[PDB]
Homo-oligomer: A and B are copies of this chain.
Amino acid sequence: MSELEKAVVALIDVFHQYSGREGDKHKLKKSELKELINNELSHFLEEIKEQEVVDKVMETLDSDGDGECDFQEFMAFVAMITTACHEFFE
């Protein structure tokens, strides 16, 4: 695969990894969203060490309101990060 294709695959891969740990296997609960951020985005986002912060992060990302982050909400999260970085460099 091309670099863009591996990137597409990794996003699906990483979401699946964290979402399939607890509860709903197709969604990220707070604990799952926290660890994904802490382990996998450690160079982009400040490590989450407060319950208020993980609550705020989930409130921001959960557009439908079921208290978890589904794949579509996760892709919206990836879009903000990538777009912010792109706007910075270009």
**Residues of A participating in the B interface, judged by any CB pair closer than 8 Å:** 1-8, 10-16, 25-26, 36, 39-44, 71-72, 75-76, 78-79, 81-83, 85-87, 89-90
Contacts and interface: CB of A to CB of B under 8 A. Distances in A.
Give the residue among A10, A39, A76 with the most B Cβ atoms within 10 A: A10
7 contacts: A5-B41, A6-B7, A7-B14, A8-B85, A12-B86, A71-B82, A72-B83
Main secondary structure of the interface of A (DSSP, over half): helix
A81 B83 CA distance: 17
Given A5-B44, A12-B89, 17 more contacts: A3-B13, A3-B40, A5-B41, A6-B10, A8-B44, A8-B82, A11-B82, A12-B82, A15-B86, A16-B89, A25-B90, A26-B90, A71-B82, A71-B87, A75-B78, A75-B82, A79-B79
